[PDB]
Amino acid sequence: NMSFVKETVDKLLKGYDIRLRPDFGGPPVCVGMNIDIASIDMVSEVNMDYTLTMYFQQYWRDKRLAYSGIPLNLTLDNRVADQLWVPDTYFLNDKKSFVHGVTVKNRMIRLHPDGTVLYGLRITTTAACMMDLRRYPLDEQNCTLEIESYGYTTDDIEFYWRGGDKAVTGVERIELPQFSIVEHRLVSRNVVFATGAYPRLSLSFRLKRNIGYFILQTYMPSILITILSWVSFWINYDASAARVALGITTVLTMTTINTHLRETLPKIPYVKAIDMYLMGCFVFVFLALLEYAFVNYIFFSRAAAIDRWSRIVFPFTFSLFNLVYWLYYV
Amino acid sequence: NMSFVKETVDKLLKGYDIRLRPDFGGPPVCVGMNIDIASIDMVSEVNMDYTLTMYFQQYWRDKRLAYSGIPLNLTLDNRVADQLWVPDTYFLNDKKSFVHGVTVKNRMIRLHPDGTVLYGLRITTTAACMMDLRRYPLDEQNCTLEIESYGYTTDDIEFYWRGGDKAVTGVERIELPQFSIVEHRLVSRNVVFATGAYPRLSLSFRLKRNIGYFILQTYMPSILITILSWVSFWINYDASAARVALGITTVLTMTTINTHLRETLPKIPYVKAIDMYLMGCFVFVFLALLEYAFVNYIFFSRAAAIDRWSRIVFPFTFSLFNLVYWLYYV
Amino acid sequence: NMSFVKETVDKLLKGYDIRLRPDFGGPPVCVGMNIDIASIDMVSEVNMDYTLTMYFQQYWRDKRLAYSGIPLNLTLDNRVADQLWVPDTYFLNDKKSFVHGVTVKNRMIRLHPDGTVLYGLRITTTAACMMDLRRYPLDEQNCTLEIESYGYTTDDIEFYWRGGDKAVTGVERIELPQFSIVEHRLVSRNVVFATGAYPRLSLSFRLKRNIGYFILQTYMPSILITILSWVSFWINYDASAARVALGITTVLTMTTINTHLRETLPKIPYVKAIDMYLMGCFVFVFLALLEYAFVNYIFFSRAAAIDRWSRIVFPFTFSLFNLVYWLYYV
Amino acid sequence: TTVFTRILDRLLDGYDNRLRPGLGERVTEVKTDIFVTSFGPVSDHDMEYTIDVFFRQSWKDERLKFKGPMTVLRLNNLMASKIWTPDTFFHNGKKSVAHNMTMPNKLLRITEDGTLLYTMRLTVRAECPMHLEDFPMDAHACPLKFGSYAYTRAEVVYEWTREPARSVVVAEDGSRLNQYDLLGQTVDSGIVQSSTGEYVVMTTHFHLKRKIGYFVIQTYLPCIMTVILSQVSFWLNRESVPARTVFGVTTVLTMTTLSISARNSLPKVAYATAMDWFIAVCYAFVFSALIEFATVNYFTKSQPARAAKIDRLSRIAFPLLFGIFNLVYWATYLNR
Amino acid sequence: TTVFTRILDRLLDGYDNRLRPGLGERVTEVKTDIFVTSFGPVSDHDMEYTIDVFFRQSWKDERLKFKGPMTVLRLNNLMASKIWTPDTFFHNGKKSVAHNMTMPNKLLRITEDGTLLYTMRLTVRAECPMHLEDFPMDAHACPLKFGSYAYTRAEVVYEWTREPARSVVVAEDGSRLNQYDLLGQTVDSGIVQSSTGEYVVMTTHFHLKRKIGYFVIQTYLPCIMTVILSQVSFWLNRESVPARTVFGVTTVLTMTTLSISARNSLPKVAYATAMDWFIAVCYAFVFSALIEFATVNYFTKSQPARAAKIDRLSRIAFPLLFGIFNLVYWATYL
Amino acid sequence: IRCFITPDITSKDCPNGHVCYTKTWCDAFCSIRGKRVDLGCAATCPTVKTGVDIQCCSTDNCNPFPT
Amino acid sequence: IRCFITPDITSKDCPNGHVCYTKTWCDAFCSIRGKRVDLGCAATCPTVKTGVDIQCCSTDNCNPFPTRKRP
Amino acid sequence: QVQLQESGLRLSCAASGHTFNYPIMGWFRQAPGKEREFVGAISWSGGSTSYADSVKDRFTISRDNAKNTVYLEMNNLKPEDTAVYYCAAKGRYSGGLYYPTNYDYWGQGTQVT
Ligand SMILES: *[C@@H]1O[C@H](CO)[C@@H](O[C@@H]2O[C@H](CO)[C@@H](O[C@@H]3O[C@H](CO[C@@H]4O[C@H](CO[C@@H]5O[C@H](CO)[C@@H](O)[C@H](O)[C@@H]5O)[C@@H](O)[C@H](O[C@@H]5O[C@H](CO)[C@@H](O)[C@H](O)[C@@H]5O)[C@@H]4O)[C@@H](O)[C@H](O[C@H]4O[C@H](CO)[C@@H](O)[C@H](O)[C@@H]4O)[C@@H]3O)[C@H](O)[C@H]2NC(C)=O)[C@H](O)[C@H]1NC(C)=O
Ligand SMILES: *[C@H]1O[C@H](CO)[C@@H](O[C@H]2O[C@H](CO)[C@@H](O[C@@H]3O[C@H](CO[C@H]4O[C@H](CO)[C@@H](O)[C@H](O)[C@@H]4O)[C@@H](O)[C@H](O)[C@@H]3O)[C@H](O)[C@H]2NC(C)=O)[C@H](O)[C@H]1NC(C)=O
Ligand SMILES: [Zn+2]
């Protein structure tokens, strides 16, 4: 009967002190966590953060909410969550988190006859993971989401992953634009602060960047302009207008590429592999123009000897530099 | 016992007037501040501010909340903060702040048997600090956070850093890609005005901008283009097309770099060291083109003497200008 | 006198059912709207919307709130609006809106002695309007605000502008940066459906985009670059480097102009008049360069005859194209 | 009249909003309806799309039966909040808002037979997965999905009010798409597994196309003219080394600018798209043309017949190669 | 002490916050005052500016008189919500926010004679209409107008606390203006007519002068060297057709790049901003220089005297023309 | 005349008009609010559009609002 | 010899400095919260700045606090 | 997986593996009686340092990323300092610095008199 369930619920809620956690004087309450990732909507290197969306479930035994005579698992409206005790769970590295409120506050309370309580939310977090761009765009990040209890110590509360490694789901279905989730790992620790030893859980994704964006219009055009400088070695030793225009226009193209790619890159004032590669190419075309300068000055003070030496050397030196760069950053 | 703790807490709450501070007629209540810095999210020069995230703890002794018979330190829900008096603290230099509400409004209350009250928050503030940028990107900034009391003077309240220099922690956790915190300083002030003495606390970071990115892209291309003008000296005095194309294309490249740096650097309509250096390089390439024009006019209306003079002078003048700039901005 | 007004207000608010509209069984309540536009803060073609700050007043006669013996227009606190029935008015074409909250959440309730009630808000609505950008930047827009009742039909509520054309004010004191308000119109439509007639009001601004800022960089660089491309015809038919450099650098300049307007223009992936003009100029310079190539192929395999033919024809063709463009888009 | 006040007061006597209709007796049938008003802009960069909808949910609640002169009655938002309503949420939403302009844009009407009808206005922003391998010749659906958050299939079941295809309706005047040209809808129902249980999920695919006019006018055509300039570079002569050199290098610079702008326009991704392949092929064509001129100039002083043969062969080889590549590319990426 | 609790409880007994003090007795008089802690960045793009202030309002309420040991008592925000406060709002605001840092940054002191003092911390993002015709030399007077929303002139009247000039005070250290200099402020009061009635409006204009050096350098100096380079083209020679042609086209391209960058710097408008005049004149000068070389080349093969005369006249004229144009421009806009 | 004219007031009739005009199309709020009922009058039975019904009329007892 | 030093509202004694001064000055923040004060114990009576109320001491008490924050 | 290694007053500690995941570096002293007691802290990036009170101005830390090695140097030794030292690594969200349990990867004890 509906009235029977109504009086049972009122009996459970009446005299319920939300402030006191379950087993206040007793041992710590064990809260089993669970996550179902819906998507990773964004991964920005500008702010070193990524947006995650997830169904976040928390299971805990609360003997005060045990009821008998109703074999069904009661599913109450979200507002009942205001009148009960829930863990003070929070994420350390979040920058701006919120619970979705589309037509209702997206929460679920599911009681059980044995006092077990399921509290689920739909949370969109903007987590912060620091990224090293030393090997960018050949990098591999380790972005993590960490979960802790803000107030209660390990003596008061206890966290664990519900179902072991199977707790977190939906990672496989994720399809990032410029990343690939190589692996996800779950960890449980106790973190000692000045106040006391708190519990912690951690969910870490190892994201490997996909190199399809960075070989076809970043390295390829710089390489080909370097080839055109090599062509500048091949023209002549007296056609001053042609060689000078070719060299300086190649320099101009490299400067244009560098400026527009820096405008394209996500504004991280730090040295990166692409930056050293492009500066190497720029220095190479600059050295080609200097080589023509030396040839012209020496003749108009052997020009053919220096031109042939440059023809032999510059391709070899650039190939050596490219091999060194590729092996160093791989 | 559940009932014993419940009735103890109920006894504490009743008879408690939140409007009245502890020892309302008595001496001022001493409040111990404490901060644990999680991270500095960003430091924006366009708005001259920085976003900080921290755990902000305040300790104060309240005899109305003292309890006996429970040797444990009671940790209650964040909602209990509604029913207790707390200091009217605020950050004087701020633009936007909030307390994280990820599944709970992030607060912790931890009553102690001797009446001591711990009030912890997790605050993501956006503090405003002045930023001189005459020496940009070689600038060295001093940003501050100014904690203060709104209504109370020293007679009613009093602030102090807890542990002295140990009050603020987590400075090592700060990872700014383009800055390095040289030091942090804590200053407690008791600023005496005619009406009364108002307390204040100041947490001041001394940031220094690393030059491993700005130097490379900002100065190496410009220096190399100036060296290409230097190449333009050595070509000839009758190869008109080659020298003219080289000089004017170097001018075009310098303009391109300047405009794209304007579009790249974060929009400070202000005179800076980088602007002075870029205009110096632009003026140098401009003078190279001008003296070639003089050479052409003299030759077609000695030319070699002017070319030798330029070869001797321009590298020396540019080295002198560079040395003066570096010594003046260091 | 103070107590008399206090007990009068208490009598009025006592036994007042907010759920029942005025004249629940009687004829529909006639709600008279009125708007004062403070400003139009934004007009974005990207999101196809515009921000509108306004003072929105609604008058309606409530016999329940009539009083006597107090010859004054009782202006009550804003909170009293929570204790009175108000129309269920909304805006049908909004995206995000709010009522300002600077020191008070901006309402005004004014009860006149004859039962009339004034309810005023200060609203910043991000209204949405269809944008037709075929003729951009010569477009001519028509953006409307659409006021409607949510639940009530014409049998319960009735809308009408107050004073007709005098209902809306402040249009003249608006000075948009990009637009100029040509005209504004007010319409009252009680749109009829099978279930019943539903009220509707429309405040429509017809705007004309001023052409004095886009015109310069959109047309004069492109046009004058085309004139330079014509100047390629006047040089010679055997001076090869000069003509080739002139034509190809004009082509490069046009491409740079197009890409920088891509970076600058407000991101409308759709064909517009500006794209047609820019492609016309680009095709003209491309045809000039191909004309030189044809002349060179003929000469080195009369050349001057074709050069003169181009000299007369190219300006004529460009003038004809420009005239057709202007007539079609004006 | 006081009769309505008495009925409203008597409706919520002994009513528990925490419980649902038929908590242990039956399953709640929530007939759903959507009327899309705007269908706001799609954002490939943000990887989502906005939509403005009138969302209606009709169900039955025997606890709120009554008798009176008026069969139907309306409720303010307070009485609506005091009454149980379904906890519908959009599975693929990112950040929606319920409009609260002057009063909260909701309406809960109750019929004498206990039939509740709950209408409300929403501006949903649903994440839209895309496959931009065929950019700009791509079509996407990325549906709108919704259902109960807390109640499983054993407790709450959703239905389409009228026939499914007629349930979701989009205002013809309200399109709000600059470049996509929405084609049609495909509505359906399904069961979604989860850690908690099985949930009824209503799905609505919004089929979309892409407008190719902007990209063909603004990116493909300038690439075509630049490569054609590289083509006609051959026809000039062999002796004018400076003119041909500046021609080739400035063509390279122009194509660099065009490629940079073209790839900056489209959203950041790793996989290569149609734009990337076309730009790469044409840029390689420009590079090949300038290398061809370089070798011609190398062989211009010795065996000039060889240089003339190379120029003659290139003049026919390069245009045909570009033509067949263009035909293959366009046929492959339009006939799909 | 229990005395203060009893006084606080007895303050609101029959008090009605819905009605202002003396709703049919007299005109409420609110004495306002502003202390601008910071003048936030002025966004010419949005024609708005942020300002962080301590807004103070003092008035009198006879209903809240009390006798006790301490003359002044301070109320928390919970009690202040039950007391009538003025309806002050900023006419030219876009999105303000009252700070709620740890507790609501507000204070409501009550004196024994009923004098209420209400202080609060505000971050007002006001709107500043701009007239960028004299860009970048333009000077602005950004307004800040505040007054009652619901109460007309006959009901609530605003006043400056001690004096108009001394009322509004700006912190000396707090300027926060990268590209502007604050030339004091001008305060006053007036009556604004509206559809509802006459309202007292308290207005404060902040005078701003744009800093000129950055724009001068970045925009004007490169343009000056480009036109000087065109003059150099006149000075070079007549025979070197390819050098002069490449030189002129690259000069035009450089001027185009500078024009584009200078336009990306300045904000969106629908008129000439007095810098687009300079850029247009410079672009016309370099374009005319290229045509001058082209027509010189047309007469270099035959009639060389005409070509030499044209070149000499161009050398004499173009520098003088740009000099007089620069003098006229600088004199006009200073 | 008894043509119930709907200029949003379906009570008053037109002496000027001679014959009624009924039009009930399905646009906009059709599935949510009903057909766009639209009455009127003119001097003669005018043309017919596709997708919406049309009935001409007489002096008296012409076209009450459908319900 | 016995004056008051500024860190507290009223200190106790200041043996070290023979001479003594008050230095109540107007600056930024001179309007709200009253006028700032800094009572001092300089061994030489300090140099006068262009506009400040330096009431130099003679004997004990020396720099009494302003009464009830009158200015 | 950062495999710490010490080296011989002067005492350096080189690291390897995923150093970026463990930016913070701690120096612990394990007495015969009481456990790992004080902390000499140093960040890999920026060289920001933090010392215990007892070891201020006498033991100082530097760093060099050319070989990824920190350098703790002892100055003015007292006889009670005779003990074994550990070099440990700590992550970006491991909590307080002065608690050994927050540190993950421990090195071999270097005994010094
Ligand atoms: C980045 O920028 C920020 C912003 O500018 C920098 O921050 C400033 O930082 C300074 C260095 O940390 C700091 O300097 C000091 O203030 C300390 C706190 O002082 C409190 O100040 C009042 C002021 O009163 C005085 O007036 C007297 C005349 O009437 C005068 O003689 C006196 O010197 C003061 O100027 C003090 O009155 C007050 O006093 C105390 O007295 C009680 C008495 O019992 C003691 O119990 C207290 O412990 C305390 O001593 C209190 O000090 C102050 O302690 C500092 O003192 C040091 O220097 C002085 C002068 O060299 C010595 O005499 C002292 O012995 C001591 O060595 C020092 O004066 C600025 O106040 C602060 N400014 C602001 C606005 O925050 C920051 O440094 C920059 N760098 C970095 C890395 O961030
Ligand atoms: C641009 O925006 C709108 C177009 O997108 C445009 O709209 C309106 O167009 C005209 C001109 O205002 C209106 O036509 C007319 O309707 C009014 C109102 O009507 C009476 O009679 C009908 C008969 O059925 C009733 O239904 C009405 O309720 C009312 O009683 C008439 O008075 C006119 O004579 C004319 O017949 C049209 O209704 C307007 N609304 C719409 C939705 O089209 C704007 O005018 C344009 N903006 C500007 C600034 O010009
Ligand atoms: Zn650019």
Author numbering:
A (entry chain C), B (entry chain B), C (entry chain E): 8 to 308, 419 to 447
D (entry chain D): 12 to 319, 391 to 418
E (entry chain A): 12 to 319, 391 to 416
F (entry chain L): 1 to 67
G (entry chain K): 1 to 71
H (entry chain F): 1 to 8, 405 to 509
Paper text:
Type A GABA (GABAA) receptors belong to the pentameric ligand-gated ion channel (pLGIC) superfamily, which includes mammalian nicotinic acetylcholine receptors (nAChRs), serotonin type 3A receptors and glycine receptors, as well as other non-mammalian homologues.
α-Cobratoxin (α-CBTx) blocks muscle nAChRs to paralyse prey, but has also been shown to act with reduced potency as an inhibitor of GABAA receptors in recombinant expression systems. Arg33 also stacks below the Tyr205 aromatic side chain, and its backbone carbonyl contributes a putative hydrogen bond with the Thr202 hydroxyl 2.7 Å away. The outward motion of loop C, which is usually associated with antagonist binding to pLGICs, is larger than the one caused by the competitive antagonist bicuculline in αβγ receptors (2.1 Å).
